[PDB]
Amino acid sequence: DNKLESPHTTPDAVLVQKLMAKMVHNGTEALVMEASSHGLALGRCDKVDFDIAVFTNLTRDHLDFHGTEEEYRDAKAKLFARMVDPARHRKIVNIDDPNAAFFLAQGNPDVPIVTFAMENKSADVHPLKFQLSLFETQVLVNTPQGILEISSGLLGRHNIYNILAAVAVGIAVGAPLEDIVKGIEEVDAVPGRCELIDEEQAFGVIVDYAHTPDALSRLLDYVRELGPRRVITVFGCAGESDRGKRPIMAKIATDKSDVTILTSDNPKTEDPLDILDDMLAGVGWSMQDYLKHGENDYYPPLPNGHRLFLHDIRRVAVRCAVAMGEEGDIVVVAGKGHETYQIEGDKKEFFDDREECREALQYVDELHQAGIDTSEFPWRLPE
């Protein structure tokens, strides 16, 4: 259950094997080595006999590193074919992805193959239920091999696809659907990645990990499909990073969000209010214009009707975004997910977590009782 601290995403293969042997000697019955596409292409999980090698989402991975598309999928297929057993390896993957079918075509054909696609009729899996919500999204899966009940996912399609892919692995061990109750409970536990709303009765808070433009865009689209009323987001850019990434990120954020807050997610020795101006230049605004408008009490909106806010410090802006939210609306924090490190300059501070959001959602009641207005960025302070 415990996980050792590792700097890289994929540790050394020899060290991983030694840790797995030490665990299997005493304190663990099974040693499963799971690595991502980059870890599998590097050789971390490749040098290990994999009983079940399935892909959750097959697409162009490590295209800039490996230099060729479908390289990670081919490496995973080769690693699975190296150590393969009859009717023991699972090929559960979405049928819509062509890389998944290309990887399933390679290797030993005696291995069991199955599809977890919902729209495909050959996969026989389908949600067949309408219970999507920010707290829990239960589906009644009706498949011959898959379990009946499904796991409550925070996302509309991504979490549903993950639950459908995990249902196959859960049913492979046990045909009874009662054994998947623990897996469904663990999936609804709101992990670090694509976290769900808090259990407390308050506005929805979704902590996500979105840094690349495409992932940020797809997460924003999924939130728009899930967000009933408003889409409130707050994020920032890292210093000495891709300079062209900031304007496209700001544009993709402002295109579909009504109100967005721009902060400094990772200063890392880079001057503040500089990359913030870079993000502001995406919507055509300059920090000078917003500052000279801030002396007034108007704050004109965007031409498309949306609104844009910004602040230097991360804590106060995040607390305001958590407080500036409607009942049916949900607040999305795509700046950082499972990460708990904020490097402001040379020193780093570990002051980024969900406990701050919980404290803000608890104290917003006292704020409203005091009479403070948190509708927009210029809080109307009484006298």
Partner: protein
Amino acid sequence: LEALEAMAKDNQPIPPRAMILSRKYRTLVSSWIEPLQEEAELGYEIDYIARYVAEGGLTGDRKRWVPRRGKTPLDPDAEGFIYSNPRETSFKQRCLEEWRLHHRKLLKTLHNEGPSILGKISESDYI
């Protein structure tokens, strides 16, 4: 106009100081128009990312319009001027200003040195 047409007669190219504002429409042919500090409609939407890539970014350094504390000219057009650039006024404002100043000096002249005129209907004319 006179200052411009006096240049090609002497065979003098335009100096490289054709400074454009943050809104990429400022030139010697833009300030005198009636809309000031306003982008012009060019059909398709403004390619903000393309403008960002063309003007700078992704390499070197970009002119960041961020206020600072040091007494340094922020706008790149106030580099040579001692104090600051002159007040921005369109051609209509300057024309009405010169017209009202002309009428003001006319009335100032007629007040003191203009009590008598050729017209002998002053009782109804001066009022």
